[PDB]
């Protein structure tokens, strides 16, 4: 669960940027660590004091992030036939 506030820098998004603080653990299984991060409104959803929201997949499906080493480029790839065809 999340503790989020509306951002305050400009008006072009004014909203949509939620300064979400939260508890978490860390390396030392015995340790904790609640930090804050800024998220776009499309990656989260609220749940029904200040409003609290988690994530829309957290009742449907698991979540992975991309390992940052790979690219995302569509590559020009020729598609060849097995011979005899």
């Amino acid at each position, epitope marked *: 669960t999340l*503790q989020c*506030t509306n951002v305050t820098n400009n008006i072009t998004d004014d909203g949509e940027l939620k300064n979400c*603080s939260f508890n978490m653990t860390t390396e030392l299984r015995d340790k*904790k660590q*609640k930090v*804050y991060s800024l998220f776009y409104r499309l990656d989260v959803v609220q749940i029904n*004091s*200040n409003k609290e929201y988690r994530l829309i997949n957290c009742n449907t499906s698991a979540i992975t992030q991309a390992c940052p080493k790979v690219s995302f480029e569509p590559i020009p790839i020729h598609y060849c036939a097995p011979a005899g065809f």
Partner: antibody
Amino acid sequence: AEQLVESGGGLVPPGRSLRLSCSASGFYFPDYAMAWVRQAPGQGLQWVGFMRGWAYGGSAQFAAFAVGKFAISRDDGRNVVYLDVKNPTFEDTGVYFCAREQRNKDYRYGQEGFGYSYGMDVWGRGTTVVVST
Amino acid sequence: DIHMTQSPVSLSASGDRVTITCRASHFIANYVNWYQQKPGKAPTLLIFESSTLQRGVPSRFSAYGDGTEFTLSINTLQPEDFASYICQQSHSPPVTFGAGTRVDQKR
């Protein structure tokens, strides 16, 4: 630098509700939770209520007399805390201190316990409100 | 409520050694912030958490305790130390303060 400016009125007629203003400066203000301590003149300190930081919920509790009689509201867009004294009484004549909360040497509050243990480092000037006509 | 009865009520000394004992009604093991308000002025934390020196407060002060009955001591007195010294708990809401000690000079 890191200073707190209390204002909001002097002579107020009783019943006519009151707005205060704990104007801050000098630091990143939603790092710290906020509280109100009043003091009747010639008396000891009389804590009114606190309000947590938003990462701690932004939750605001009070003292026993301050249940219903008062209402805290902070504004990080201005770095100011408004205190609402609805139906002021002549009992509520006193100097009104406002202070912040102090993080540790690791810049944190307490994990277990109440959470707030490192006191109120910067004290404001205090505003003086007399509830009389 | 957990009440602080701070002892003494007033104090008189002259470079003397001052000792102030503030007790409780419950077990507050180390959760007391020791304050200083000079008259007509703001408060000033002296010993946070009943034993540890606040940065900016000189080393002539010393607080400690037991769990219920805490004790501040001063070695030694300075002529600007004649102020009101207040114990205050940090164990439980609501915030309760101490009696204070308006200190004058023994004469």
